């Protein structure tokens, strides 16, 4: 009942980019994570949880029938057909095994949701690829086919009858797919901190700015924290969690926390441009264990430096397992640019959250 679940299957390595041997979204991402968890002795301290394939009905909580059908058909396509389809999307490749792996990727999160919601485990982490947070109702995007966490959130609500789910997205990119899916939904609060640079950084969306707060019944339930300078450090992230995310999370009172656990903000990532120490993720994970009775499930999103991502996963896992948090060399003092972004997000969200008022 107190344990930490871990899901990993070899199927997560069984797809890769057929037309770019240097593609950064590659099978080594997950095998290096598993190898470091093993050598650090963390893997043996976790409860191994089996994966499962998502069902059509589960996919349809988020995705359209037509899109599911098209994705299913990719398993029978030629390489030329896969490339022609992949090129209709932004930042996507395809592979004959992609669909099968994507179904296990979603299902791995659902397995952990089952165990955590029924108190069989305290928390858990799926070491999954493909990632999910960019995937949309009817299209692939950003190396994602299905939106793992969006499905998991609606599954927790439908199956386990959870009323409120908090999704925390600390990947360096905006999870616009999650934002879109829950745009009008007050039962799922989406928080994303991401590099933005006034739209210069991918995916270059105006909707990634803090003015996008959700709409209709969902007004106030979408919170974007855009960084407009590179080089953010641990103290910038800790400060954002302390000033903005935690006060709102406690007011929202979620019954489950899902984390889009990308590690492309870690020092050394080839694209993220940030300078967050892997150890920072021990602290960020610890800061999220205080809501939802500690019912916390992390799922791997991005992170392209094999060592940096593995270290970030290990740091998060140490906190899931209850190990005392490391001391951070860096002082938790944020930079001026981070404070500017945090204050602006608070300004945009204050009408909706009593915890964000004076
Ligand atoms: C051209 C560049 C802007 C583009 C890109 O970087 N996309 C991108 C999308 C999602 C993630 C992610 O999942 N991060 O966690 C990471 C990167 C790209 C496209 C094709 C091959 C390489 C790179
Ligand atoms: K993010
Ligand atoms: K929402
Ligand atoms: Zn990313």
TrEMBL record:
Quote one Gene Ontology molecular function term. Answer: protein lysine deacetylase activity
Q: Does the keyword Nuclease apply?
A: no
Where located?
A: Cell projection, Axon; Cell projection, Dendrite; Cytoplasm, Cytoskeleton, Cilium basal body; Cytoplasm, Cytoskeleton, Microtubule organizing center, Centrosome
Which amino acid positions bind Zn(2+) 1, per UniProt? 171, 173, 264
Q: Name the UniProt key words of this record, in alphabetical order.
A: Actin-binding, Cell projection, Chromatin regulator, Cytoplasm, Cytoskeleton, Hydrolase, Metal-binding, Methylation, Nucleus, Phosphoprotein, Repeat, Repressor, Transcription, Transcription regulation, Transferase, Ubl conjugation, Ubl conjugation pathway, Zinc, Zinc-finger
Asked if the record carries the keyword Ubl conjugation, the reply is yes
Q: Name one GO biological process term.
A: regulation of microtubule-based process
The Gene Ontology CC terms held by the record are:
axon; centrosome; cytoplasm; cytosol; dendrite; nucleus; perikaryon
Looking at the record's lineage, which domain of life comes first? Answer: Eukaryota
Q: Which family does it belong to?
A: Belongs to the histone deacetylase family. HD type 2 subfamily.
Q: What is this protein called?
A: Protein deacetylase HDAC6
Q: Which organism is it from?
A: Danio rerio (Zebrafish)
């Amino acid at each position: 009942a107190t344990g930490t679940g871990l899901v990993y299957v070899d199927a997560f390595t069984r797809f890769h980019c057929l037309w770019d041997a240097s593609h950064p979204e590659c099978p080594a991402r997950v095998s290096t994570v598993m190898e470091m968890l093993e050598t650090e002795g963390l893997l043996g301290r976790c409860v191994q949880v089996e994966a499962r394939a998502v069902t059509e009905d589960e996919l349809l909580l988020v995705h359209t029938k037509e899109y599911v059908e098209l994705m299913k058909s990719t398993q029978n396509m030629t390489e030329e057909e896969l490339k022609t389809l992949a090129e209709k999307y932004d930042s996507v490749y395809l592979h004959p095994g992609f669909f099968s792996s994507a179904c296990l990727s979603v299902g791995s999160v659902l397995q952990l949701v089952d165990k955590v919601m029924t108190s069989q485990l305290r928390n858990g982490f799926s070491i999954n690829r493909p990632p999910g947070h960019h995937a949309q109702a009817d299209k692939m995007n950003g190396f994602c086919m299905f939106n793992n966490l969006a499905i998991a959130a609606r599954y927790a609500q439908k199956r386990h009858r959870v009323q409120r789910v908090l999704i925390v997205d600390w990947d360096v990119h905006h999870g616009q797919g999650i934002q879109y899916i829950f745009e009008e939904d007050p039962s799922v609060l989406y928080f994303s901190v991401h590099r933005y640079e006034d739209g210069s950084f991918w995916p270059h969306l105006k909707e990634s700015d803090s003015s996008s707060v959700g709409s209709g019944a969902g007004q106030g339930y979408n919170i974007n924290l855009p960084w407009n300078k590179v080089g953010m450090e641990s103290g910038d992230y800790i400060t954002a969690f302390q000033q903005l995310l935690l006060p709102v999370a406690y007011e929202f009172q979620p019954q489950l926390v899902l984390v889009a656990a990308g590690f492309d903000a870690v020092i050394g990532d080839p694209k993220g441009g940030m300078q967050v120490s892997p150890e920072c993720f021990s602290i960020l994970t610890h800061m999220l264990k205080g809501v939802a009775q500690g019912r916390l499930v992390l799922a791997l999103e991005g992170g392209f430096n094999l060592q940096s991502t593995a270290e970030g996963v290990c740091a998060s896992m140490r906190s899931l397992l209850g190990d005392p948090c490391p001391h951070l060399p860096s002082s938790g003092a944020p930079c001026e640019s981070a404070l500017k972004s945090i204050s602006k997000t608070i300004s945009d969200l204050y009408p909706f959250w009593k915890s964000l008022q004076t």
